[PDB]
């Protein structure tokens, strides 16, 4: 079935210290498995999933060292962006990178992801073709022009088509391919029925009648309700023989 890897990296500069805080969180199929924090014991990549600790020491020596490179990279860009947007010192600014690969059916690549945001707004993103960029503000037109003369998208496509999908395989092969499917209750209280779908995995669920966002239940599974005796509530989830009904 569908598989995905993602790395959410964030760098926050604040008026207090000189180096910004850099955090990286990896996700395989929307479960967190590796983290890096620059505000730590000794900043390093640590496994965040039990199936991930059997990796070997050479693996964390590269990732930690590559993480230290990313953080410097983010430190330099943030300073670069103050000039691009004519921001004087005295504030806090966030730089974010989202990157990863959606696999599929045949353990093949579907769509690559490489995109950045500044002050939580879209700043520049690698397109579906993995060869051209999209830049919203004029301040990012600068970056697009120099990343074009840089051949930057070439490096990133090599990653997304290269180590991204190769290393997604080996993590997957190592709890993940399982399916918890929802318990379904309805709250019979008025002033207005309310359908509950509890304890399911993964989070892709759908409820309708004859609204709140799917959220984690604190233990690795999810939860959702829909708000509204001639009415029925239908549940639709991956692990379901047929969509379930309840009035």
């Amino acid at each position: 079935g569908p598989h995905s890897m993602r790395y959410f990296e964030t760098a926050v500069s604040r008026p207090g210290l000189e180096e910004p805080r850099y955090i990286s969180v990896g996700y395989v199929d929307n479960k967190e498995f590796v983290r890096f924090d620059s505000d730590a014991e000794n900043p390093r990549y640590e496994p965040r999933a039990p199936w991930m600790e059997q990796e070997g020491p050479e693996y964390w020596e590269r990732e930690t060292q590559k993480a230290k490179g990313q953080e410097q990279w983010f430190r330099v860009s943030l300073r670069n962006l103050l000039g691009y947007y004519n921001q004087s010192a005295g504030g806090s600014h966030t730089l974010q990178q989202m990157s990863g690969c959606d696999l599929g059916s045949d353990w093949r690549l579907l769509r690559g992801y490489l995109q950045f945001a500044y002050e939580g707004r879209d700043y520049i993103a690698l397109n579906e073709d993995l060869k051209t960029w999209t830049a919203a503000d004029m301040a990012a037109q600068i970056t697009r022009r120099k990343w074009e003369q840089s051949g930057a998208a070439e490096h990133y496509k090599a990653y997304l088509e290269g180590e991204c999908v190769e290393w997604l395989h080996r993590y997957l092969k190592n709890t993940l391919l399982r399916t918890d499917s929802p318990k379904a209750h309805v709250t019979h209280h008025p002033r207005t029925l309310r359908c509950w779908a509890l304890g399911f995995y993964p989070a892709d669920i759908t409820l309708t009648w004859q609204l709140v966002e799917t959220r984690p239940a604190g233990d690795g599974t999810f939860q959702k309700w829909a708000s509204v005796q001639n009415y029925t509530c239908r549940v639709y989830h991956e692990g379901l023989p047929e969509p379930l009904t309840l009035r």
């Binding site: 990286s24 990313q70 990343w147 990653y159 991204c164 290393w167």
Partner: peptide, 9 residues
């Protein structure tokens, strides 16, 4: 495995 960034912004 994380990605290594080329040219900065």
């Amino acid at each position: 495995k994380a990605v290594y960034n080329x040219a900065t912004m």
